[PDB]
Design a protein around this ligand. Structure first.
Ligand SMILES: [Cl-]
Ligand SMILES: [Cl-]
Ligand SMILES: [Cl-]
Length: 163
């Protein structure tokens, strides 16, 4: 574990992370996709060998020795608010199991279901609170990656509210 497990947020491309493993905002089919998924495919294409996995699950594939945890959040265009909420919480619980099994001291994570899978809603608080529910019992340093300036501020405030 990290000596004093922490949460941090950075506004930059998760493909440039400084952590021991990365979480992909994957699609269920292991396709290159859009947004964060396409950035992950450009940096770690080898990790998309047999990465297909269902909604609400995570599947780890190595790129060399570097673990890529493909986490499949629900697309709120297709799911009801109720069933999507359940599957989004489930994907983060599976990320926490994978981070624990790998023995890493740090992980780079994007907010699942906040981009092309948001169904055109602002899901920062919903997605971040399910991230915390899963990751709070882990001892990895967690570094959340975002791209919007206002979201960086809101994520940073939310981390500070609990310290
Ligand atoms: Cl960047
Ligand atoms: Cl998304
Ligand atoms: Cl963002």
């Amino acid at each position: 574990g990290a000596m004093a497990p922490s949460y941090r947020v950075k506004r930059m491309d998760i493909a440039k992370n400084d952590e021991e493993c990365v979480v992909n905002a994957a699609n269920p089919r292991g396709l290159p996709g859009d947004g964060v998924c396409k950035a992950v495919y450009k940096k770690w294409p080898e990790s998309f060998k047999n990465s297909a996995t269902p909604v609400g699950t995570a599947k780890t594939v190595m790129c060399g020795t570097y673990p890529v945890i493909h986490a499949v959040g629900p697309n709120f265009s297709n799911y009801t608010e109720s069933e999507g909420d359940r599957e989004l919480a489930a994907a983060y619980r599976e990320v926490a199991k994978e981070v624990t099994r790998l023995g890493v001291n740090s992980v780079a994570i994007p907010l699942l279901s906040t981009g092309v899978y948001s169904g055109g809603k602002d899901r920062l608080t919903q997605s971040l609170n399910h991230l915390f529910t899963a990751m709070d019992s882990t001892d990895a340093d967690v570094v959340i990656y975002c791209r919007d300036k206002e979201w960086e501020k809101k994520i940073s405030e939310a981390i500070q509210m609990r310290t």
